[PDB]
Amino acid sequence: ATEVTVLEGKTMGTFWRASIPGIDAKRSAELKEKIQTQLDADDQLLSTYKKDSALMRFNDSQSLSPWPVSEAMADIVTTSLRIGAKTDGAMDITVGPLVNLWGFGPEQQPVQIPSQEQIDAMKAKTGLQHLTVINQSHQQYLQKDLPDLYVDLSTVGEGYAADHLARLMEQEGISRYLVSVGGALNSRGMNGEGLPWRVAIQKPVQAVVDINGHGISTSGSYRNYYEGKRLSHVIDPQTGRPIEHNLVSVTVIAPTALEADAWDTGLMVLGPEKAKEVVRREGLAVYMITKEGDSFKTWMSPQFKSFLV
Ligand SMILES: [Ca+2]
Ligand code: NA
């Protein structure tokens, strides 16, 4: 039994954690500095709450020509656009202005219920089709065909950050770790007890999965979870209205946390029936919780079940 060192801090409006076994204390001290520095840089790349972030500079710009961005920005957006297509638009990184219209952004509250005409007009300003990624040998770009398109990567940033943290671990010669950024995690190697890192999914008891060599993410709709007296604040990108189905939690295991974090949001928006079709077609490892009145129901794909201990 070797000691597991735990490092923790703040990033992206949430928290990160890194567990590492058998690492001495001057190393884990330095590693925290590097982790926080990297996560600060990722936050500065992606945040919609930082006014001079790379993403916000693009958002504020009125240009319809290619806008230079980093490799990570290009790849995050490519992944998001494609999983958006594969979830029939349900995962939409351009939906922000519809969310703001409702006042359902996390740093805002009171606004009138918008009219459908208002919603439909606002939809003209959103859509996965409006965004393009351009890759070349030493450069890459985003390009929007609408000046007032607004890109929000908050639904995939944790997954990216978690994958980027694993890259950092490798860089620093760390072979065994459990790293998390918000709801996204990557697992590799054995813990202090010589066993796979414990990753639990809540089943209303904890069901345990071994996701060694994989990543995981969960997305939910919680305004109903704890009662249904209220609406979801999850907006369907296609209707511009709150989702109406009973799916309250989706957990995805994938080779990368970014993929998991992209899928879980899309599947959540789709609801049980449509999500299951996507999960079947794409061969995804997914765990779903639905709330019927007062009762909770769960569903796991076969691919998810492979991860159960
Ligand atoms: Ca997500
Ligand atoms: Na549109």
Short mmCIF file of C-alpha atoms and ligand atoms in Angstrom, two decimals:
data_model
loop_
_atom_site.label_atom_id
_atom_site.label_comp_id
_atom_site.label_asym_id
_atom_site.label_seq_id
_atom_site.Cartn_x
_atom_site.Cartn_y
_atom_site.Cartn_z
CA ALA A 1 0.00 0.00 0.00
CA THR A 2 1.57 3.25 -1.22
CA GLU A 3 0.35 6.74 -0.34
CA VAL A 4 -1.98 8.53 -2.76
CA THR A 5 -1.24 12.25 -3.01
CA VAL A 6 -4.24 14.46 -3.80
CA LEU A 7 -3.92 17.90 -5.39
CA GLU A 8 -6.92 20.18 -5.83
CA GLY A 9 -7.75 23.69 -6.98
CA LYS A 10 -10.15 25.96 -8.85
CA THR A 11 -10.64 26.32 -12.60
CA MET A 12 -13.36 27.20 -15.12
CA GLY A 13 -15.93 28.10 -12.46
CA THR A 14 -15.50 24.63 -10.94
CA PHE A 15 -12.74 22.48 -9.40
CA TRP A 16 -9.99 20.09 -10.47
CA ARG A 17 -8.43 17.13 -8.66
CA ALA A 18 -5.41 14.94 -9.33
CA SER A 19 -4.65 11.74 -7.43
CA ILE A 20 -1.20 10.21 -7.82
CA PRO A 21 0.34 7.25 -5.96
CA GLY A 22 3.90 6.88 -4.69
CA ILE A 23 5.01 10.41 -5.61
CA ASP A 24 7.27 12.34 -3.24
CA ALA A 25 6.23 15.69 -1.80
CA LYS A 26 8.60 18.11 -3.60
CA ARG A 27 7.45 16.64 -6.92
CA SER A 28 3.74 16.82 -6.12
CA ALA A 29 4.28 20.38 -4.89
CA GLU A 30 5.82 21.44 -8.21
CA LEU A 31 3.23 19.45 -10.15
CA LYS A 32 0.42 21.49 -8.55
CA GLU A 33 2.06 24.69 -9.83
CA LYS A 34 2.24 23.26 -13.36
CA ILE A 35 -1.32 21.91 -13.22
CA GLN A 36 -2.78 25.23 -12.05
CA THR A 37 -0.76 27.18 -14.61
CA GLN A 38 -1.97 24.96 -17.44
CA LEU A 39 -5.60 25.09 -16.28
CA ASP A 40 -5.37 28.87 -15.96
CA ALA A 41 -4.21 28.95 -19.60
CA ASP A 42 -7.04 26.65 -20.70
CA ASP A 43 -9.55 28.85 -18.87
CA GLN A 44 -8.02 31.88 -20.62
CA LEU A 45 -8.42 30.08 -23.96
CA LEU A 46 -12.03 28.98 -23.53
CA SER A 47 -13.95 31.01 -20.95
CA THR A 48 -17.06 32.98 -21.90
CA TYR A 49 -16.88 34.75 -18.52
CA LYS A 50 -13.39 36.10 -19.20
CA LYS A 51 -13.85 39.13 -21.45
CA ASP A 52 -10.46 38.87 -23.18
CA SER A 53 -10.37 35.09 -23.56
CA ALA A 54 -9.44 33.72 -26.99
CA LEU A 55 -13.01 32.52 -27.48
CA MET A 56 -14.51 35.85 -26.42
CA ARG A 57 -12.23 37.81 -28.76
CA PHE A 58 -13.61 35.65 -31.57
CA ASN A 59 -17.15 36.14 -30.25
CA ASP A 60 -16.79 39.92 -30.08
CA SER A 61 -15.29 40.14 -33.57
CA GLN A 62 -17.54 40.98 -36.52
CA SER A 63 -15.25 39.30 -39.05
CA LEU A 64 -16.57 36.61 -41.40
CA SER A 65 -13.07 35.59 -42.53
CA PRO A 66 -10.74 33.00 -40.96
CA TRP A 67 -9.72 33.94 -37.41
CA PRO A 68 -6.43 32.51 -36.10
CA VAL A 69 -6.76 30.14 -33.12
CA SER A 70 -4.73 27.51 -31.26
CA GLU A 71 -4.59 23.82 -32.17
CA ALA A 72 -6.69 23.00 -29.08
CA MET A 73 -9.38 25.52 -30.04
CA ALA A 74 -9.57 24.08 -33.57
CA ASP A 75 -9.79 20.46 -32.35
CA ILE A 76 -12.29 21.16 -29.57
CA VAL A 77 -14.53 22.90 -32.09
CA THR A 78 -14.13 20.16 -34.73
CA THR A 79 -15.06 17.50 -32.20
CA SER A 80 -18.02 19.55 -30.99
CA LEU A 81 -19.39 20.20 -34.48
CA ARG A 82 -19.21 16.54 -35.46
CA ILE A 83 -20.81 15.22 -32.29
CA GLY A 84 -23.39 17.97 -32.80
CA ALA A 85 -24.18 16.45 -36.21
CA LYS A 86 -24.24 12.90 -34.81
CA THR A 87 -26.77 13.97 -32.11
CA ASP A 88 -29.01 15.62 -34.73
CA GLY A 89 -28.11 19.12 -33.49
CA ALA A 90 -28.82 18.36 -29.82
CA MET A 91 -25.24 19.18 -28.85
CA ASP A 92 -24.93 22.77 -30.05
CA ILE A 93 -22.04 25.02 -29.07
CA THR A 94 -23.82 27.99 -30.74
CA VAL A 95 -27.00 27.79 -28.61
CA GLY A 96 -25.81 30.43 -26.13
CA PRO A 97 -28.01 33.31 -27.26
CA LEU A 98 -31.14 31.13 -26.86
CA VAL A 99 -29.98 30.23 -23.34
CA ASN A 100 -29.37 33.92 -22.57
CA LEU A 101 -32.77 34.79 -24.00
CA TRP A 102 -34.36 32.66 -21.27
CA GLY A 103 -32.04 34.02 -18.59
CA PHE A 104 -30.84 30.47 -17.91
CA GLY A 105 -27.14 31.38 -18.05
CA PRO A 106 -25.56 30.62 -14.67
CA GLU A 107 -24.59 34.26 -14.02
CA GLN A 108 -28.04 35.76 -14.64
CA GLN A 109 -31.63 35.30 -13.42
CA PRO A 110 -34.62 37.51 -14.04
CA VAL A 111 -36.00 37.90 -17.54
CA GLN A 112 -39.47 37.53 -19.03
CA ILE A 113 -40.51 34.23 -20.58
CA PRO A 114 -39.69 34.82 -24.25
CA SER A 115 -42.37 34.51 -26.94
CA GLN A 116 -42.11 31.85 -29.63
CA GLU A 117 -41.69 34.53 -32.30
CA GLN A 118 -38.77 35.83 -30.25
CA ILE A 119 -37.35 32.32 -29.91
CA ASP A 120 -37.76 31.62 -33.63
CA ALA A 121 -36.10 34.90 -34.57
CA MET A 122 -33.24 34.18 -32.18
CA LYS A 123 -32.73 30.78 -33.82
CA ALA A 124 -31.65 32.61 -36.98
CA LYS A 125 -28.55 33.60 -34.99
CA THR A 126 -27.61 30.00 -34.03
CA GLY A 127 -26.80 26.71 -35.75
CA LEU A 128 -23.87 24.32 -36.17
CA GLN A 129 -23.71 25.11 -39.90
CA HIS A 130 -22.48 28.64 -39.22
CA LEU A 131 -19.03 27.56 -37.99
CA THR A 132 -15.97 26.22 -39.83
CA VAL A 133 -12.52 25.01 -38.70
CA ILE A 134 -9.50 25.42 -40.98
CA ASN A 135 -6.26 23.48 -40.43
CA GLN A 136 -2.88 24.08 -42.07
CA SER A 137 0.72 23.05 -41.34
CA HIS A 138 1.66 25.87 -38.88
CA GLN A 139 -1.72 27.61 -38.36
CA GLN A 140 -5.42 27.03 -37.85
CA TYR A 141 -8.58 29.12 -37.84
CA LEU A 142 -12.21 29.45 -36.90
CA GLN A 143 -14.58 31.06 -39.37
CA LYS A 144 -18.18 32.15 -38.83
CA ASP A 145 -20.61 33.21 -41.58
CA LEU A 146 -22.63 35.31 -39.12
CA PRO A 147 -20.97 38.18 -37.22
CA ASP A 148 -23.21 37.73 -34.19
CA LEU A 149 -22.74 33.96 -33.90
CA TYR A 150 -21.77 33.21 -30.31
CA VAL A 151 -19.71 30.18 -29.39
CA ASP A 152 -19.80 28.68 -25.91
CA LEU A 153 -17.55 25.72 -25.13
CA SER A 154 -18.57 25.32 -21.49
CA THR A 155 -20.26 21.96 -22.20
CA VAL A 156 -16.97 20.46 -23.48
CA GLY A 157 -14.26 22.44 -21.69
CA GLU A 158 -14.01 20.15 -18.67
CA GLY A 159 -13.44 17.13 -20.90
CA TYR A 160 -10.76 18.95 -22.86
CA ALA A 161 -9.09 20.15 -19.67
CA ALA A 162 -9.08 16.64 -18.23
CA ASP A 163 -7.47 15.23 -21.40
CA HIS A 164 -4.97 18.09 -21.40
CA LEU A 165 -4.12 17.27 -17.76
CA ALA A 166 -3.33 13.68 -18.76
CA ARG A 167 -0.96 15.07 -21.41
CA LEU A 168 0.70 17.08 -18.63
CA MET A 169 1.01 14.00 -16.43
CA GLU A 170 2.86 12.17 -19.23
CA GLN A 171 5.08 15.14 -19.87
CA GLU A 172 6.09 14.97 -16.20
CA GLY A 173 6.75 11.23 -16.23
CA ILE A 174 3.60 10.33 -14.28
CA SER A 175 2.19 6.97 -15.40
CA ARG A 176 -0.49 6.43 -12.73
CA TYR A 177 -3.18 8.99 -12.01
CA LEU A 178 -6.82 9.91 -11.67
CA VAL A 179 -7.38 13.45 -12.95
CA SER A 180 -10.64 15.35 -12.91
CA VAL A 181 -11.88 18.73 -14.04
CA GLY A 182 -15.45 19.32 -12.91
CA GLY A 183 -17.52 16.34 -14.02
CA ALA A 184 -14.86 14.96 -16.39
CA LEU A 185 -12.27 12.33 -15.38
CA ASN A 186 -9.40 10.31 -16.86
CA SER A 187 -8.16 7.11 -15.15
CA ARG A 188 -4.81 5.40 -15.68
CA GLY A 189 -3.01 2.67 -13.76
CA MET A 190 -3.36 1.36 -10.23
CA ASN A 191 -4.12 3.32 -7.06
CA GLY A 192 -2.18 3.11 -3.79
CA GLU A 193 -3.63 -0.34 -3.09
CA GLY A 194 -2.50 -1.70 -6.46
CA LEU A 195 -6.09 -1.67 -7.75
CA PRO A 196 -7.87 0.26 -10.53
CA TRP A 197 -8.94 3.76 -9.48
CA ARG A 198 -12.42 3.67 -7.99
CA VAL A 199 -14.92 5.48 -10.16
CA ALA A 200 -18.48 5.38 -8.89
CA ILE A 201 -21.77 6.16 -10.56
CA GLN A 202 -24.69 7.06 -8.34
CA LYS A 203 -27.62 4.70 -8.81
CA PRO A 204 -30.85 6.03 -7.30
CA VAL A 205 -26.11 3.18 -3.95
CA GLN A 206 -22.87 3.48 -5.93
CA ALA A 207 -22.17 1.20 -8.88
CA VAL A 208 -18.43 0.89 -9.50
CA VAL A 209 -16.72 1.06 -12.89
CA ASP A 210 -13.13 0.51 -13.94
CA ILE A 211 -12.33 3.08 -16.63
CA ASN A 212 -8.56 2.46 -16.72
CA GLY A 213 -7.24 3.90 -19.98
CA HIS A 214 -10.50 5.80 -20.55
CA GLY A 215 -12.32 9.01 -19.69
CA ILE A 216 -15.79 9.69 -18.30
CA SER A 217 -18.24 12.59 -18.06
CA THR A 218 -21.71 13.18 -16.67
CA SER A 219 -24.33 15.75 -17.70
CA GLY A 220 -27.67 16.35 -16.01
CA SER A 221 -30.82 18.38 -15.52
CA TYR A 222 -31.17 19.01 -11.81
CA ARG A 223 -34.06 21.44 -11.33
CA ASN A 224 -36.37 18.40 -11.47
CA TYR A 225 -34.00 15.83 -9.92
CA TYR A 226 -34.80 16.98 -6.37
CA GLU A 227 -38.62 17.17 -6.38
CA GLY A 228 -41.96 18.15 -11.06
CA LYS A 229 -42.78 21.66 -9.86
CA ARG A 230 -40.42 23.43 -12.31
CA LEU A 231 -39.05 23.50 -15.87
CA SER A 232 -35.67 22.23 -16.96
CA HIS A 233 -33.16 24.99 -17.72
CA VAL A 234 -31.64 22.79 -20.40
CA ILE A 235 -32.64 24.37 -23.71
CA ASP A 236 -33.25 22.20 -26.76
CA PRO A 237 -31.21 23.87 -29.55
CA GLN A 238 -33.82 22.89 -32.16
CA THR A 239 -36.95 24.14 -30.34
CA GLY A 240 -35.34 26.98 -28.38
CA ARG A 241 -37.48 25.78 -25.48
CA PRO A 242 -36.72 23.76 -22.33
CA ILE A 243 -36.43 19.99 -22.77
CA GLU A 244 -39.65 18.19 -21.77
CA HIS A 245 -38.55 14.57 -21.42
CA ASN A 246 -37.67 12.77 -18.18
CA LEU A 247 -33.95 12.09 -18.70
CA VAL A 248 -32.14 13.72 -15.76
CA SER A 249 -28.61 12.29 -16.00
CA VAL A 250 -26.34 10.90 -18.71
CA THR A 251 -22.90 9.44 -18.06
CA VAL A 252 -20.59 8.59 -20.94
CA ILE A 253 -17.38 6.56 -20.95
CA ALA A 254 -15.16 7.10 -24.00
CA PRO A 255 -11.49 6.83 -24.99
CA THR A 256 -11.17 10.56 -24.17
CA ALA A 257 -12.94 12.81 -21.65
CA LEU A 258 -13.52 15.43 -24.36
CA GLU A 259 -15.57 12.93 -26.37
CA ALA A 260 -17.45 11.90 -23.24
CA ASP A 261 -18.17 15.52 -22.37
CA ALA A 262 -19.42 16.18 -25.92
CA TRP A 263 -21.74 13.16 -26.03
CA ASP A 264 -23.22 13.45 -22.54
CA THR A 265 -24.68 16.90 -23.18
CA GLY A 266 -26.12 15.95 -26.58
CA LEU A 267 -27.67 12.72 -25.32
CA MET A 268 -29.15 14.57 -22.36
CA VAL A 269 -30.89 17.06 -24.69
CA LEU A 270 -32.18 14.27 -26.96
CA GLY A 271 -33.98 12.38 -24.19
CA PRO A 272 -34.24 8.61 -23.62
CA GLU A 273 -35.71 7.39 -26.91
CA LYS A 274 -33.54 9.35 -29.33
CA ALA A 275 -30.43 9.02 -27.15
CA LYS A 276 -30.71 5.22 -27.21
CA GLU A 277 -30.80 5.28 -31.01
CA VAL A 278 -27.63 7.36 -31.11
CA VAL A 279 -25.97 5.18 -28.48
CA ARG A 280 -26.80 2.04 -30.48
CA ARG A 281 -25.66 3.42 -33.84
CA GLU A 282 -22.43 4.93 -32.51
CA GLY A 283 -21.66 2.04 -30.14
CA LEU A 284 -21.39 4.32 -27.09
CA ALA A 285 -20.86 3.38 -23.43
CA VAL A 286 -23.67 5.25 -21.68
CA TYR A 287 -25.56 5.23 -18.40
CA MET A 288 -28.94 6.99 -18.21
CA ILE A 289 -31.14 8.03 -15.31
CA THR A 290 -34.78 8.96 -15.91
CA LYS A 291 -37.16 10.37 -13.30
CA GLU A 292 -40.82 9.35 -13.68
CA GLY A 293 -42.90 11.35 -11.22
CA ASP A 294 -41.29 10.14 -7.99
CA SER A 295 -39.54 7.06 -9.39
CA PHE A 296 -36.02 6.81 -10.83
CA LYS A 297 -35.19 4.39 -13.67
CA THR A 298 -31.73 3.55 -15.02
CA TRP A 299 -30.41 2.16 -18.32
CA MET A 300 -26.92 1.04 -19.40
CA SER A 301 -25.71 0.22 -22.88
CA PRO A 302 -23.78 -3.05 -23.29
CA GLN A 303 -20.64 -1.03 -23.87
CA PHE A 304 -21.09 0.66 -20.50
CA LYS A 305 -21.65 -2.68 -18.79
CA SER A 306 -18.19 -3.82 -19.92
CA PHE A 307 -16.78 -1.24 -17.51
CA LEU A 308 -18.67 -2.56 -14.47
CA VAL A 309 -16.47 -4.34 -11.92
CA CA B 1 -20.83 18.00 -21.50
NA NA B 2 -30.59 28.75 -36.95
#
